Design a binder for this molecule. Structure first.
Ligand SMILES: Cc1cc2nc3c(=O)[nH]c(=O)nc-3n(C[C@H](O)[C@H](O)[C@H](O)COP(=O)(O)O)c2cc1C
Length: 147
């Protein structure tokens, strides 16, 4: 299986998360391409991937704002080759804000209108993902099983 993992992380929580999902994947026999959104490009980004996992933190406080590095890609999802593509989304937040992990919400929806297949619902980590370590391992686990 060929997986793509793209992430936008500010204080590196979602990045740690991405790393955990990657190693879970890799340990299962998947080929894993892990990329910081800082550096990526949308034009056919997803082409040649059997699985695309999108990760992003939630900022904003009183409105939803996507992790900084992430926005540009988000603006361009219609150009990644998403349709028919099998995808899952993940991100860090804090349940204390009005819009808990609203960036996961946003991304999936856009994916969905694009014609992508959400094979599993989004992992919405509240707090330090080093403290949800298991959750992480388990969601990685169910995404494989739903492909
Ligand atoms: C000023 C600020 C605003 C935040 N706003 C939101 C928010 O609107 N929704 C939410 O789920 N979490 C929110 N959070 C918290 C985070 O997303 C949390 O810090 C996450 O662990 C950061 O991830 P990262 O390092 O990958 O970028 C905010 C954090 C700060 C400091």
């Amino acid at each position: 299986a060929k997986a793509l993992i793209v992430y936008g992380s500010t204080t590196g929580n979602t990045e740690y998360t991405a790393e955990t999902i990657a190693r879970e994947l890799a340990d299962a026999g998947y080929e894993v391409d892990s990329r910081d959104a800082a550096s990526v490009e949308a034009g056919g980004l997803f082409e040649g991937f059997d699985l695309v996992l999108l990760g992003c933190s939630t900022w904003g406080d009183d409105s939803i704002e996507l992790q900084d590095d992430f926005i540009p890609l988000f603006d361009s999802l219609e150009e990644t080759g998403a349709q028919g593509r099998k995808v899952a989304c993940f991100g860090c937040g804090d349940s204390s804000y009005e819009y808990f992990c609203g960036a996961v919400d946003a991304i999936e929806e856009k994916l969905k209108n694009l014609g992508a297949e959400i094979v599993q619902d989004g992992l919405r980590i509240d707090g330090d993902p080093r403290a949800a370590r298991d959750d992480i391992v388990g969601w990685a686990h169910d995404v494989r099983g739903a492909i």
